[PDB]
Ligand binder design. Sequence first.
Ligand SMILES: N#Cc1ccc(N2CCN(CCCCc3c[nH]c4cc(O)c(C#N)cc34)CC2)cc1
Length: 207
Amino acid sequence: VETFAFQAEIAQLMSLIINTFYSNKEIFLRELISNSSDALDKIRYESLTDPSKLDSGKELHINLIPNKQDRTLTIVDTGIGMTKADLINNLGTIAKSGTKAFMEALQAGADISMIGQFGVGFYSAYLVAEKVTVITKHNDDEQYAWESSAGGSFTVRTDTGEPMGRGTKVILHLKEDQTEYLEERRIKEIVKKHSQFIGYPITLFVE
Ligand SMILES: N#Cc1ccc(N2CCN(CCCCc3c[nH]c4cc(O)c(C#N)cc34)CC2)cc1
């Protein structure tokens, strides 16, 4: 297991998301589903020129899987997946400018629900999760687990869990007072409200 420090500005953003009083937390799900959709768009586009990229799985879709026993909500997709370099370097570097702009916008009167307009919607996960685990598999690479409970650091390791084929699984370890997002009717409500026209099947598992 390798442990890394967040860039200072990203650590600052995560603390802001964790510490700021803001009741409209449900928007986290839209941001994560949007990121899944983008990843599915990507593998779909690449396969138009290289069909063999779907050898790792042809079905393009999103599963939402609540687990009250583990207190997790998992978002699973069969998109393009992420490389080790994505998890350690690339996505963090890209996030620097959007993080800066978002925090400046909040100072000028924007609210947290606008976070996706700055390309850093992922971090809204920490509105509801004490820990986020991301398992991912890209065609050109091994299966990895990225994880962070904030506090300035994250880890990356090779994942030895069930093989995924291709795609990304975001496991939200929910805060004790955010278990409403494990309820079928609540998740259904949020998907209909904010993610109504996503161009891939979204299957909400029940327990
Ligand atoms: N400094 C720094 C720094 C160093 C690393 C990170 N992480 C780099 C990995 N990220 C993993 C989540 C990426 C965002 C995401 C949410 N739902 C998805 C669904 C998907 O299908 C794909 C794909 N493909 C992507 C996502 C976390 C942040 C941050 C900051």
